[PDB]
């Protein structure tokens, strides 16, 4: 049950709020009341406290609540002004992706594709888990963070391990494993 409701929250808060009549503010926030009513049109047993539990217990830091407002921290496919802190300490960042994507990435770099930002991780396991969601022969990409910073692509702390960046030029991918 928790996972079904969390997935629908991610759909609403990252991709299609307007399908439920919700309009996020410039920071990606909608009211908690609004989200709850939206979720109840699919899962009528949902309550504000159950959503608060989802948020507190999320293992990746998917969600954030500011008072009576909630957003997804990352993953959006529509414009958001996020106020996350910069990751200045990480030396290496990781991105897992099916091997079938590697020729294109070696030419183009990582691109945000359908989302606003490229997502990477400080954590090798989480990067690989993400890649494996997409397909079978996952490669772990090792990314030189300081390369990114040098080229004006600042990295931001979007979740526990999740990091967001505008793009990752192929020169900043040091290894594919």
Swiss-Prot record:
Record-linked SUPFAM superfamilies: ADP-ribosylation
Lineage top rank: taxon: Archaea
Gene3D superfamilies: 3.20.170.30, RNA 2'-phosphotransferase, Tpt1/KptA family, N-terminal domain
Enzyme class: transferase
Gene Ontology BP terms: tRNA splicing, via endonucleolytic cleavage and ligation
Disulfide bonds: none
Keywords of this entry: NAD, Transferase
This protein's record includes keyword Transferase: yes
EC numbers on record: 2.7.1.-
Gene Ontology MF term list: NAD+ poly-ADP-ribosyltransferase activity; tRNA 2'-phosphotransferase activity
Entry similarity comment: Belongs to the KptA/TPT1 family.
Role noted for this protein: Removes the 2'-phosphate from RNA via an intermediate in which the phosphate is ADP-ribosylated by NAD followed by a presumed transesterification to release the RNA and generate ADP-ribose 1''-2''-cyclic phosphate (APPR>P). May function as an ADP-ribosylase.
Cross-referenced NCBIfam families: PRK00819.1-2
Protein name (database record): Probable RNA 2'-phosphotransferase
Encoding gene, per UniProt annotation: kptA
């Amino acid at each position: 049950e928790r996972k079904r409701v969390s997935k629908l929250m991610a759909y609403i808060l990252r991709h299609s709020p307007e399908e439920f009549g919700l309009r996020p503010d410039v920071e990606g926030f909608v009211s908690l009341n609004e989200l709850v009513n939206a979720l109840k049109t699919v899962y009528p047993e949902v309550t504000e406290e159950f959503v608060r539990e989802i948020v507190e217990n999320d293992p990746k830091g998917r969600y954030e609540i500011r008072g009576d407002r909630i957003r997804a921290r990352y993953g959006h496919s529509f414009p958001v002004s996020l106020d996350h802190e910069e990751d200045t300490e990480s030396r290496f960042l990781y991105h897992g992706t099916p091997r079938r994507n590697l020729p294109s990435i070696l030419k183009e770099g990582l691109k945000p594709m359908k989302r606003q930002y490229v997502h990477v991780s400080t954590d090798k396991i989480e990067a690989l888990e993400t890649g494996r969601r997409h397909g079978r022969e996952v490669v772990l990409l090792v990314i030189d963070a300081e390369c990114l910073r040098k080229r004006g692509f600042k990295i931001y702390k979007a979740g526990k391990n999740v990091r967001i960046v505008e793009r990752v030029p192929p020169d900043c991918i040091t290894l594919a494993v």
